[PDB]
Symmetry: C2
Subunit: 238 residues, 2 copies
Amino acid sequence: SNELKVREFYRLHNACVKLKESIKLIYENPLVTDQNVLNLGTAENTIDYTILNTPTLNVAKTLLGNRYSLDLIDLFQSHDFKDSNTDVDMFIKYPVVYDENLENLAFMHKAHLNDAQKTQLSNERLEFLGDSWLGALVSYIVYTRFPSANEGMLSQMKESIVNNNNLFDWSTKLNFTKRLQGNIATPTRVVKDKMSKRYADCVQAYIGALVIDRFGTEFLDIKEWLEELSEKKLAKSS
Amino acid sequence: SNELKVREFYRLHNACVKLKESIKLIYENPLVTDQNVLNLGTAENTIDYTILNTPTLNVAKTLLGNRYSLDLIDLFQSHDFKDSNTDVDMFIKYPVVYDENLENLAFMHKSQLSNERLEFLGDSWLGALVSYIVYTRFPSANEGMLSQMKESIVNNNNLFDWSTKLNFTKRLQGNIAKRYADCVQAYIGALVIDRFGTEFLDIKEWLEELSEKKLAK
């Protein structure tokens, strides 16, 4: 329950961060603030009319119009809200997964259960997802961090980060070795199992869990678009 | 003119979609609602205290308290706001790049300015998005099946077919009767650059901190 509060806090905080970003865009948008880009009372077959008549502009205008009563930007500012730091960070080591079952799944390896159900009790799917998303987030980091680098420099920098050796070093830093301890442990006196790959996979799976919990609408249009293009391939689900 | 308005319209609409998503999460968060099902405060421990005195909770409680004056969820519904369909879709064939300079750069082939970095970025984001698609769409597939499905989608042959359907051809040619796949990828790179905001920001910052040694090099 204590842990659940921390989990729900970051879910809440990240939603606040998104709201703040979103409202700033809306308040300052060229289409919303003046009539300097979008003329009023233009003819039915003009783009200005089409746009001004959208639910979107009606909502945006209503929001901008209500600032006198509650100014969302000023709300955040007056409470000294910070996006990337909060007082609760003291209680955590790394970004939090909101769903406790999902977090625990990230560390799970290989009467009875269906091969389908054991599949849900294995971090394999999460690892697959997390591997892809680690690559994308790191690619974004290198691309934005080195605006002059060419493809070869970006690829190399990325490779230096996402390789298994580096991920195993991350697992140690994040203390995943303890996460994987349960009832059965090899004593200090007997030769241990090979654990390196297993640790690296957990890192990927943990990122996969962070992604499942955070994926919302930021890239939803791209996502739906890609899913549509992929609809024929996705149909071959045998 | 028309074109600039469409670009700005989608930037605005996507911000409205995110606002609507976030406000719902804020209104319905267990820490904020009255049931107080997690016994925030009642428990009387240091974390309860820390949580209660955050800007975050203070902001959220103010938002909830103002619903009687303006309820953001009702606002959207009362205007029949739809996330994925708008009257402006008339003007477009596929998702819009807000920055026209960025869109143009995506069509500038490698060997000066070129799309090579965008292609790099967009190739990894295509992979991540398709991975998310198959993961969520086949909740029971094993890793092997997910990989087979994904690979059947993101290979250069499929990407070539897409570039054709999308008519990225009629944009690069006119006079004369792998390059094209790279454009599809660069375009996604552009879409990504335009949309990346706060949704994955905490993970991105954490990964960057973890990567600082490597990046300093």
